């Protein structure tokens, strides 16, 4: 999966 | 609530308590009862609260895949029937799931948003309406999936617009919110050239003012900078 | 009982389904509900219960002992009052902790130990009986503080005198048994030179029988082996 | 701590 904060 | 009868500040020593425990249920119980008490949130106490709520959302995410992808194993040509069992607790997983997002959405619509007028706190909540409404997006296939996907777009955007009026380009919040939105757009909207250019029109204009930032706040800034990239590597 | 109206064996596919996903609540409830229908449990069927609680209650134990841990410092000489949180949230999770024990305690006395009568099954409720009152003696402070070590100890000894009579020396079940009562030796009853006997006595009695075993039997049991040799190096 | 199964 991508990349989220 | 059953946190009605403790104080505010008690609440907020319990979520971070809490927090040191791994105990992210309980953290996100202790802030949803300090979001009730009524008060606006300070800066620190809006990230106790995300942190609560994306742990314990996530783990659930994470375990609604693993189901479905079983599921979806179970329903190819040449398997063997099992039963209603693997779509029963995929179901369960997924209402427990959407409980959790409609119980964000709920704070944030009663009422941290309409009380929220400086950009730091109103771009952090709108943020966390798009992240909520896009992890019903994941789950979502009936009738309502698109007002689901619009209602995260709308909020996104408005954020975005925000934003960009009122933050520089490495404030971490803006950064954040456009890694978010850009991948919303690539994972939601069937949208990987929109991604793409915002993670890259983000990076770029972030690049630009790290020179007028502190030591600690380049730390803060190119942190999530390197996400970025991270996407745009995992996409090009 | 909740899940009272779901199928034996669909409770049992369930508990398997929530293993891969993580969700080791869930697992636990699947397991109670499997076990409440009164049927004895096969070999697999105890493992997947004993997996269950022991990642529940393993949780809990971690988040005490961090909660713990702040509580003695907050308590120490010099340090800045802070209220009655600590203790009230340590409490909280002590609470919980204890009603997951007094839950897997009771399936055990009802009724599976009483219906146990193979070595493999009864050595197994037992060590789990061991292992759950050994928990609550991990937080227990009170007038029944002996009381509870020594129905650990109790629970533990019968379980011992069965697996000598019944199992070979390198049954994996036997050994796990020794390993986590030399456990309570060391850290519960203050019995290090007792935890160091025993530990030493299982794994030399164990090696002494590896020659009779397949391949895969070997596997299992040097998997224990390696723990028992672990906790020697710790304590000598 | 110490290993325990
Ligand atoms: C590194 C990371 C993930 O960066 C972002 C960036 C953008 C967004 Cl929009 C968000 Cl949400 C997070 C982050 O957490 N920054 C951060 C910023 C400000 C305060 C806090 C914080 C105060 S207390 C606390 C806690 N955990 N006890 C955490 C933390
Ligand atoms: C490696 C480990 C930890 O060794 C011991 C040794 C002694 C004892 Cl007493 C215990 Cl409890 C465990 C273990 O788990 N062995 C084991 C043995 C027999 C069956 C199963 C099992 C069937 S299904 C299942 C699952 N998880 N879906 C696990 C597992």
């Given amino acids: 999966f991508p990349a989220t904060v | 609530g059953a946190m009605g009868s403790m104080e505010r500040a008690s609440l907020i020593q319990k979520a971070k308590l809490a927090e040191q425990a791994e105990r992210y249920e309980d953290m996100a119980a202790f802030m949803k009862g300090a979001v009730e008490k009524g008060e606006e949130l300070s800066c620190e106490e809006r990230n106790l609260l995300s942190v609560a709520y994306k742990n314990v959302v996530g783990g659930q995410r994470a375990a609604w ?15 063997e ?10 179901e369960k997983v997924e209402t427990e799931l959407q409980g959790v997002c409609d119980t964000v959405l709920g704070l944030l619509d009663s009422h941290l948003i309409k009380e929220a007028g400086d950009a730091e706190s109103r771009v952090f909540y709108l943020k966390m309406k798009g992240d909520y409404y896009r992890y019903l997006a994941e789950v979502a296939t009936g009738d309502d999936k698109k007002r689901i996907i619009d209602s995260a777009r709308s909020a996104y955007q408005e954020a975005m617009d925000i934003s960009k009026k009122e933050m520089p380009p490495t404030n971490p919040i803006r950064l954040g919110l456009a890694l978010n939105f850009s991948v919303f757009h690539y994972e939601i909207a069937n949208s990987p050239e929109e991604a793409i250019s915002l993670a ?16 600690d706040s380049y730390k803060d ?12 590597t995992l996409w090009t």
């Fill in chain 2, 65 to 79: 895949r693993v189901l479905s992808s079983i599921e979806q194993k179970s329903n190819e040509e040449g398997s």
């Fill in chain 2, 81 to 90: 029937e099992k039963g209603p069992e693997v779509r029963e607790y995929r």
């Fill in chain 2, 200 to 215: 890259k029109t983000t990076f770029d204009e972030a690049m630009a003012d790290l020179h007028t930032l502190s030591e």
């Fill in chain 2, 221 to 232: 800034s190119t942190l999530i900078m390197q996400l970025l990239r991270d996407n745009l």
